[PDB]
Design an enzyme around this catalytic site. Structure first.
Site, PDB file in Angstrom:
ATOM      1  N   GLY B 160     -20.407  -0.390-173.184  1.00  0.00           N
ATOM      2  CA  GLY B 160     -20.251  -1.137-171.909  1.00  0.00           C
ATOM      3  C   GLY B 160     -21.583  -1.742-171.480  1.00  0.00           C
ATOM      4  N   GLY B 162     -23.284  -3.902-167.798  1.00  0.00           N
ATOM      5  CA  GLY B 162     -23.143  -4.628-166.525  1.00  0.00           C
ATOM      6  C   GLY B 162     -24.481  -4.984-165.894  1.00  0.00           C
ATOM      7  N   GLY B 165     -26.359  -1.504-165.108  1.00  0.00           N
ATOM      8  CA  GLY B 165     -26.638  -0.587-166.209  1.00  0.00           C
ATOM      9  C   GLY B 165     -25.748  -0.780-167.416  1.00  0.00           C
ATOM     10  CD  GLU B 166     -28.220  -0.550-169.570  1.00  0.00           C
ATOM     11  OE1 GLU B 166     -28.756   0.578-169.674  1.00  0.00           O
ATOM     12  OE2 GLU B 166     -28.648  -1.411-168.763  1.00  0.00           O
ATOM     13  CE  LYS B 182     -20.340   2.311-163.978  1.00  0.00           C
ATOM     14  NZ  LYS B 182     -19.039   1.698-163.594  1.00  0.00           N
ATOM     15  CG  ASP B 279     -13.326  -5.381-158.816  1.00  0.00           C
ATOM     16  OD1 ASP B 279     -12.883  -6.560-158.721  1.00  0.00           O
ATOM     17  OD2 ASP B 279     -14.492  -5.132-159.220  1.00  0.00           O
TER      18      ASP B 279
HETATM   19  O1  LIG Z   1     -22.800  -2.526-163.582  1.00  0.00           O
HETATM   20  C1  LIG Z   1     -21.667  -2.110-163.815  1.00  0.00           C
HETATM   21  N1  LIG Z   1     -20.693  -2.056-162.906  1.00  0.00           N
HETATM   22  C2  LIG Z   1     -20.831  -2.606-161.578  1.00  0.00           C
HETATM   23  C3  LIG Z   1     -21.536  -1.647-160.653  1.00  0.00           C
HETATM   24  C4  LIG Z   1     -21.494  -0.259-160.843  1.00  0.00           C
HETATM   25  C5  LIG Z   1     -22.155   0.548-159.928  1.00  0.00           C
HETATM   26  C6  LIG Z   1     -22.837  -0.036-158.860  1.00  0.00           C
HETATM   27  C7  LIG Z   1     -22.856  -1.417-158.707  1.00  0.00           C
HETATM   28  N2  LIG Z   1     -22.206  -2.183-159.593  1.00  0.00           N
HETATM   29  C8  LIG Z   1     -21.308  -1.744-165.221  1.00  0.00           C
HETATM   30  C9  LIG Z   1     -20.169  -2.317-165.777  1.00  0.00           C
HETATM   31  C10 LIG Z   1     -19.779  -2.046-167.090  1.00  0.00           C
HETATM   32  C11 LIG Z   1     -18.541  -2.648-167.676  1.00  0.00           C
HETATM   33  C12 LIG Z   1     -18.474  -4.158-167.408  1.00  0.00           C
HETATM   34  C13 LIG Z   1     -17.209  -4.779-167.959  1.00  0.00           C
HETATM   35  N3  LIG Z   1     -16.032  -4.038-167.490  1.00  0.00           N
HETATM   36  C14 LIG Z   1     -16.074  -2.623-167.877  1.00  0.00           C
HETATM   37  C15 LIG Z   1     -17.250  -1.991-167.163  1.00  0.00           C
HETATM   38  C16 LIG Z   1     -17.136  -0.481-167.335  1.00  0.00           C
HETATM   39  O2  LIG Z   1     -17.290  -0.139-168.694  1.00  0.00           O
HETATM   40  C17 LIG Z   1     -16.845   1.006-169.308  1.00  0.00           C
HETATM   41  C18 LIG Z   1     -16.980   1.045-170.702  1.00  0.00           C
HETATM   42  C19 LIG Z   1     -16.569   2.157-171.439  1.00  0.00           C
HETATM   43  C20 LIG Z   1     -16.030   3.225-170.750  1.00  0.00           C
HETATM   44  C21 LIG Z   1     -15.894   3.185-169.401  1.00  0.00           C
HETATM   45  C22 LIG Z   1     -16.296   2.101-168.635  1.00  0.00           C
HETATM   46  O3  LIG Z   1     -15.334   4.350-168.988  1.00  0.00           O
HETATM   47  C23 LIG Z   1     -15.033   5.159-170.134  1.00  0.00           C
HETATM   48  O4  LIG Z   1     -15.570   4.411-171.234  1.00  0.00           O
HETATM   49  C24 LIG Z   1     -20.576  -1.182-167.844  1.00  0.00           C
HETATM   50  C25 LIG Z   1     -21.729  -0.616-167.288  1.00  0.00           C
HETATM   51  C26 LIG Z   1     -22.094  -0.898-165.971  1.00  0.00           C
HETATM   52  F1  LIG Z   1     -23.198  -0.362-165.426  1.00  0.00           F
END
Ligand SMILES: O=C(NCc1ccccn1)c1cc([C@@H]2CCNC[C@H]2COc2ccc3c(c2)OCO3)ccc1F
Ligand SMILES: [Mg+2]
Lengths: 57, 613, 339
Positions: B160, B162, B165-166, B182, B279
């Site tokens: 993942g 975003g 983070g990652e 996460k 969302d």
């Molecule tokens: O930054 C991210 N999310 C938005 C956020 C979070 C907290 C505070 C403010 N904003 C973020 C998003 C992602 C991805 C972006 C695309 N959509 C999926 C999402 C989540 O990804 C996952 C990927 C694999 C996973 C999972 C979640 O749960 C179990 O396994 C990955 C890391 C991240 F840090």
């Protein structure tokens, strides 16, 4: 507290009806016993290390 | 790495710890996975009268999972004519169902409450007394002392990415269970100013993460570090539906039916715990590796159990009218509209209200507010009814918002074929199995430390199934030999360990004292707390040393390096510092010492022979 | 009224008592003994430092063989010591941690004890097994047991914080007889040599005397300004001593029915915790809260010496039936045997 005082009067009645000797005499019977049995009292009469279970063996 | 159970002497302290919280009842122990198992072991073997009753409960429990009617018809008659078959109107409720050839899972459910009524009392008293209860206490201590770091997980591949983070995949060392991680960056969060979002996600995860829901990305643990926040979630290594939509293109009706069916129950789960997801969009749905799905990224979600939110949060494509308008509050209704936008996008490749590939946020909102559902004629009759139902701009009419919630959606003709017991059982085949080795399967487009003070967290039901599935029966065996050897070692040597028994002992167990006040050198001992003193012994003896309740003046915590200690200031002004093996023992010793030293000093004052003046 | 008559008729009696008391007060014991020779400078040395108990010692008692002694501690045990060897014949862990008193049966068979448990418990040391058992748990009191004493192996006497004392049939396990009178917590009790009478001393600042078989009090004794922590019979069964919180000890006489002497000093400010007579009667030993035990001349009331071994408070003591030794237990956790 009807019985509480009635007990106390009965009780003090008992404590009064006793034949009481006197302090010169009682003091002398205490002194008579002390003096009499003083031989066999290790804490007055320093018994030697042989006689004492707590000195050597 | 592996889990080390503490010794069965932990029973004393933990029996008290849990008794303090109210947790040694048939209900609270039977209700726990690890509790039920130990209870059953006892009744079937080590009590003769109980044999029939638990066998019956298990034959009832087996009966509830039976998938076809034919199986239940036979196993009703076998249970009725069996050697086990005490009650009067229990028989009449079942004889009425049997006479009318009917056999639901909850057929014998009247016997569940009544078998439980015969298992409380005599039989449960015999369990608490048994060796099986001891073993319960040993497991429960491990639970309440979990402190996680990066080092307790084996971090694998980035799955993942975003703006904050990652996400990483991982295994948990001690049980071998597989999970996701996460990992959010604090420096970035400071520059981009998203401290609230980070903190919000943590709370929401903990709301949904019980009842073992096949259809949400639940949490088992949370924690943080000087630069990073971290969540430990259900493993979803299959990528999000924003990548997959952009790979696969749009989906069939029957394929979307599968995704719908699972997401629906995932929503049924959040809604039965009063969470609005907010969302819902492809980028937040996520696939396992059989292709079953779960919902994720709860950072914009909201408890609607108390105050229903009003803010315009979501994403411009997928917001309900009620969300977009300020001064309008909303509940779970937002999810059923979002579902429609998202299911329509799964069928068409763009939000219904993001016409002409425009970035004009202002325009996108007014289309959501004003215009209506341009549904293609290709969509089937049973499907058309569904999305019109989900995309109602007025909540009054929106499907799943009329009263019976998710079942209003389940009864839809669109799902007429389904046996929803088979759906919840993951017994229907998924439409997209994700390929092995896929990069970017869940990316997105691209003082202060005080805010994250209380971030760490753990979920009991999750940690307990994790254990029961994995290491439990083998650890119980490893431990039962380990214990039974040392009880043969005590019986044959002619030396029982019963210094606590037949007295007025409060609580006993190990801790570690520092007895070299210049040097800093720690020593471990077995303590017996009695009402007036804290005795302690070393290896193989009666106790030779103590401290009186009388002499203790205060009981504080102090930090020495990274050791959380108890600092008893003793009369003199000398310092007696103690270190416990686990958080719950630190809480209990601090509590029972305070409670014993105050109780002692109060009582000692009331006794002429014992007080000073 | 009925109240005021029976409360003034009490003073009329208490006066008739206090007059007959003063009638008998011809001379002081101090005068009667002014002439007899000083005991000298009694310096006892510490002979046995008995370590073992792990916090404050509160009580101890000697067996009739003049050798085996039982003791009771803050650490929740009875240790039946053999004073000669410094060795333990029995360690009896106890059902209750708040032990305050303990006893020893004349037969050598049974012991008893109690404390804040409000129970006097009997222990048999002549089982078939070859160990110690609990033959009876004598229950009936309603306050902290502060003393107890066997008369024979069938029967025993007890004192408590509830302000009562009692005689028990051990066979059936019931109170044969009960003894009421006191008004503040009873702290100590002493039996007679014939064992038809015994005496109690309490925080009321008074002491009392009872016939075992009748069931009622005979005589009551006052004088101290503060709690009476300790009591012991004069060897002949016709007088007894006391230790008190006011910084003084005192002797009282049964037939004379009053106070004979007070043992004190301007330097001494702290209180007294225990009293025993030497086998003859001549020394009165007492334990203090300035860490010392003072040996008083019983007849002359001079400070005859200082047992100054302990580094905290002296709490209990006892003299053997053969007179050979004095045992002192302290708050520093050690017993000491002296002579
Ligand atoms: O930054 C991210 N999310 C938005 C956020 C979070 C907290 C505070 C403010 N904003 C973020 C998003 C992602 C991805 C972006 C695309 N959509 C999926 C999402 C989540 O990804 C996952 C990927 C694999 C996973 C999972 C979640 O749960 C179990 O396994 C990955 C890391 C991240 F840090
Ligand atoms: Mg709004």
């Amino acid at each position: 507290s009807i019985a509480q005082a009635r007990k106390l009067v009965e009780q003090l009645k008992m404590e009064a009806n006793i034949d009481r000797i006197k302090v010169s005499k009682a003091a002398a019977d205490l002194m008579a016993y002390c003096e009499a049995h003083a031989k066999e009292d290790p804490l007055l009469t320093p018994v030697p290390a042989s006689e004492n279970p707590f000195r050597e063996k | 790495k592996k889990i080390l159970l503490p010794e069965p002497s932990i029973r004393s302290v933990m029996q008290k710890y849990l008794e303090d919280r109210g947790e040694v009842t048939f209900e609270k122990i039977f209700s726990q996975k690890l509790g039920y198992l130990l209870f059953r072991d006892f009744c079937l073997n080590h009590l003769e009268e109980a044999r029939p009753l638990v066998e019956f409960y298990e034959e009832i429990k087996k009966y509830e999972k039976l998938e076809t009617e034919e199986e239940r018809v036979a196993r009703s008659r076998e249970i009725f004519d069996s050697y086990i078959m005490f009650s009067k109107s229990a028989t009449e409720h079942v004889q009425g169902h049997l006479g009318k050839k009917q056999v639901p899972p909850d057929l014998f459910q009247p016997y569940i409450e009544e078998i439980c009524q015969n298992l409380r009392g005599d039989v449960f008293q015999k369990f608490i007394e048994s060796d099986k209860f001891t073993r319960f206490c040993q497991w429960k201590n491990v639970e309440l002392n979990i402190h996680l770091t990066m080092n307790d997980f084996s971090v694998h591949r980035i799955i993942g990415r975003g703006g904050f983070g990652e996400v990483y995949g991982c295994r948990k060392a001690d049980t071998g269970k597989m999970y996701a991680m996460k990992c959010l960056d604090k420096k970035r969060i400071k520059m981009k100013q998203g401290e609230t979002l980070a903190l919000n996600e943590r709370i929401m995860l903990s709301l949904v993460s019980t009842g073992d829901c096949p259809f949400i990305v639940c949490m088992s643990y949370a924690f943080h570090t000087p630069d990073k926040l971290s969540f430990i979630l259900d493993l979803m290594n299959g990528g999000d539906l924003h990548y997959h939509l952009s790979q696969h293109g749009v989906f069939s009706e029957a394929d979307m039916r599968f995704y719908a069916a699972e997401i629906i129950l995932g929503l049924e789960h959040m809604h039965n715990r009063f969470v609005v997801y907010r969302d819902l969009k492809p980028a937040n749905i996520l696939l396992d590796e059989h292709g079953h799905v779960r919902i994720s990224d709860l950072g914009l979600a909201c408890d609607f159990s108390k105050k229903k939110p009003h803010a315009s949060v979501g994403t411009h494509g997928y917001m309900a009218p009620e969300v977009l308008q300020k001064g309008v509050a909303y509940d779970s209704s937002a999810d059923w509209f979002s579902l429609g936008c998202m299911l329509f996008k799964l069928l068409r490749g763009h939000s219904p209200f993001r016409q002409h590939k425009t970035k004009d946020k202002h325009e996108i909102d007014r289309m959501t507010l004003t215009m209506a559902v341009e549904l293609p004629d290709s969509f089937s009759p049973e499907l058309r009814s569904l999305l019109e139902g989900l995309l109602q701009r007025d909540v009054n009419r929106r499907l799943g918002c009329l009263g019976r919630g998710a079942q209003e959606v389940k009864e839809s003709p669109f799902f007429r074929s389904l046996d929803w017991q088979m759906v919840f059982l993951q017994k229907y085949p998924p439409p997209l199995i994700p390929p092995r080795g896929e990069v970017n399967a869940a990316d997105a487009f691209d003082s202060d430390q005080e805010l994250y003070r209380n971030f760490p967290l753990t979920i009991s039901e999750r940690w307990q199934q994790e254990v029961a599935e994995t290491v439990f029966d083998t650890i119980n065996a490893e431990t039962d030999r380990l214990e039974a050897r040392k009880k043969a070692k005590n019986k044959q040597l002619g030396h029982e360990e019963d210094y606590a028994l037949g007295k007025d002992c409060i609580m006993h167990g190990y801790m570690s004292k520092m007895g070299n006040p210049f040097l800093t050198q720690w020593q471990r001992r077995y303590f017996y707390l009695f009402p007036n003193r804290l005795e302690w012994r070393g290896e193989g003896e009666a106790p030779q040393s103590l401290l009186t309740m009388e002499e203790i003046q205060s009981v504080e915590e102090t930090q020495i390096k990274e050791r959380k200690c108890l600092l008893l200031k003793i009369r003199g002004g000398k310092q007696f510092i103690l270190q416990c093996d686990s958080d719950p023992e630190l809480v209990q010793w601090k509590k029972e010492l305070r409670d014993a030293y105050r109780e002692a000093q109060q009582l000692v004052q009331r006794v002429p022979k014992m007080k000073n003046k | 009224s009925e109240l005021d008559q029976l409360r003034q008729e009490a003073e009329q009696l208490k006066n008739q008592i206090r007059d007959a008391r003063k009638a008998c007060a011809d001379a002081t014991l101090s005068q009667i003994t002014n002439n007899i020779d000083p005991v000298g400078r009694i310096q006892m040395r510490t002979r046995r430092t008995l370590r073992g108990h792990l916090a404050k010692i509160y009580a101890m008692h000697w067996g009739t063989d003049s050798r085996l002694l039982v003791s009771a501690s803050q650490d929740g045990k009875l240790i039946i010591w053999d004073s000669y060897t410094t060795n333990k014949v029995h360690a009896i862990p106890l059902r209750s941690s708040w032990v305050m008193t303990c006893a020893y049966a004349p037969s050598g068979n049974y012991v008893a004890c109690g404390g804040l448990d409000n129970i006097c418990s009997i222990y048999n040391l002549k089982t078939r097994e070859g160990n110690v058992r609990v033959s009876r748990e004598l229950a009936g009191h309603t306050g902290y047991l502060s003393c107890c004493r066997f008369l024979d192996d069938n029967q025993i006497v007890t004192s408590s914080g509830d302000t009562t004392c009692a005689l028990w049939d051990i066979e059936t396990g019931q109170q044969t007889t009960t003894f009421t009178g006191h008004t503040g917590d009873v702290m100590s009790l002493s039996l007679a040599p014939d064992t038809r009478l015994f005496v109690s001393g309490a925080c009321d600042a008074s002491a009392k005397l009872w016939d075992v078989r009748e069931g009622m009090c005979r005589q009551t004794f006052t004088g101290h300004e503060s709690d009476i922590n300790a009591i012991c019979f004069f060897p002949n069964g016709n007088a007894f001593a006391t230790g008190s919180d006011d910084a003084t000890c005192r002797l009282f006489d049964l037939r004379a029915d009053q106070e004979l002497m007070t043992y004190s000093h301007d330097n001494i400010i702290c209180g007294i915790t225990s009293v025993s007579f030497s086998k003859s009667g001549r020394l009165l030993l007492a334990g203090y809260d300035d860490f010392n035990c003072n040996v008083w001349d019983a007849l002359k009331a001079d400070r005859a010496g200082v047992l100054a071994g302990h580094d905290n408070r002296v709490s209990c003591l006892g003299v053997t039936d053969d007179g050979m030794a004095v045992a002192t237990g302290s708050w520093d956790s050690f017993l000491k045997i002296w002579n």
